[PDB]
From a paper:
The fifth step in the de novo biosynthetic pathway is catalyzed by the enzyme orotate phosphoribosyltransfrase that synthesises orotidine 5′-monophosphate (OMP) and pyrophosphate from α-D-5-phosphoribosyl-1-pyrophosphate (PRPP) and orotate (OA). In all the structures herein described, both monomers composing the functional homodimeric unit are related by a 2-fold axis, with a solvent excluded surface between monomers of 1045 Å2 (13% of each subunit surface).
A PRPP molecule could be unambiguously identified in the active site in both monomers of the binary complex with the substrate crystallized in absence of Mg2+. Refinement statistics gave good correlation coefficient score (CC) for the PRPP molecule (CC = 0.89).
Author numbering:
A (entry chain A): 4 to 19, 22 to 30, 33 to 95, 105 to 178
B (entry chain B): -9 to 18, 34 to 97, 104 to 177
Write the structure that this text describes.
Amino acid sequence: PDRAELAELVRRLSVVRVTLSSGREYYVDLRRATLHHRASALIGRLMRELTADWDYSVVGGLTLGADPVATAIMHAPGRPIDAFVVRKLIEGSEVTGQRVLVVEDTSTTGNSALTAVHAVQDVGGEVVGVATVVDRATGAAEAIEAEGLRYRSVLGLADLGL
Amino acid sequence: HHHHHIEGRHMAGPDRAELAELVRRLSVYVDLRRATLHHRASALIGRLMRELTADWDYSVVGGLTLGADPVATAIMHAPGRPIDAFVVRKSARLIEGSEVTGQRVLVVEDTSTTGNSALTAVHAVQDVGGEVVGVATVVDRATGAAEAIEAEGLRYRSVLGLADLG
Ligand SMILES: O=P(O)(O)OC[C@H]1O[C@H](OP(=O)(O)OP(=O)(O)O)[C@H](O)[C@@H]1O
Ligand SMILES: O=P(O)(O)OC[C@H]1O[C@H](OP(=O)(O)OP(=O)(O)O)[C@H](O)[C@@H]1O
């Protein structure tokens, strides 16, 4: 019900003929939903449920995509979880000595979320897993699991109705 | 110091004094991000900035990344009428998130020093046809930012002042 409402809002808000960054070939603009009053609340609530079995006190990722996902999780009802942001180094709550959830809005390569995992690691945080709003079946899952980390997402590529 | 009026004085109560506590503890020698990205302080920030700006008409809230962002999302997530958010990039789209064109907008900032960051976000919004109804900050530090904001004919309001920070 929530997941269905979220998926509808994402197709509606974020699946927007286009010359890409690539030079190739709709495109997905996840920030239209992560910065939307309702979608962002659903994101916060579903991401908590998605990672309930994990142990972490602090959530964040690489600016900019990850930031409203992290704060949406911090604000959504439930137990206290603080937030941070990785610049391009760490801002917001202390991750040093901490259990950290790394988030992304949607990964392509996983580089961004990884840059974020390593920036956390290089200052002493322990990363427990990576969670994203939308997986797009692009290899990010695989790249992330190739460093010992669990990867999960709320929605998959099917939910985008492509 | 160039002391400016702190409109947040008038909404005294438990929420304001708790937040002032949290900002002294987490942020003071001053790192506001520790409060803006903190679960309780951010939630109070959302509640209070909504209250501070209740007589203002806007449907979207945001400012210049990074400082503005957790203040904007805090407002968006707090209880009450639906308010969406956006983020002005330092460079690029330039404005990311919800649509601001033809909208009434609140620009926010965690704390301003010169006012340059907030005025940058304001101008970026105007340039894409958004209407900025004011600027609100969490903490004013009597630095002259409020005057620079007001010199363009914008309204300005803050929740806390220097005195709330010790
Ligand atoms: O790094 P990858 O796993 O390939 O992911 C592609 C990235 O593209 C977007 O961020 P973008 O590069 O647009 O930067 P922004 O977050 O500053 O907009 C999105 O948030 C992804 O993190
Ligand atoms: O003189 P002003 O333009 O009013 O600037 C005041 C800003 O300075 C600080 O951030 P900082 O610029 O250090 O970091 P950021 O740009 O990454 O938010 C603070 O968070 C305010 O946003």
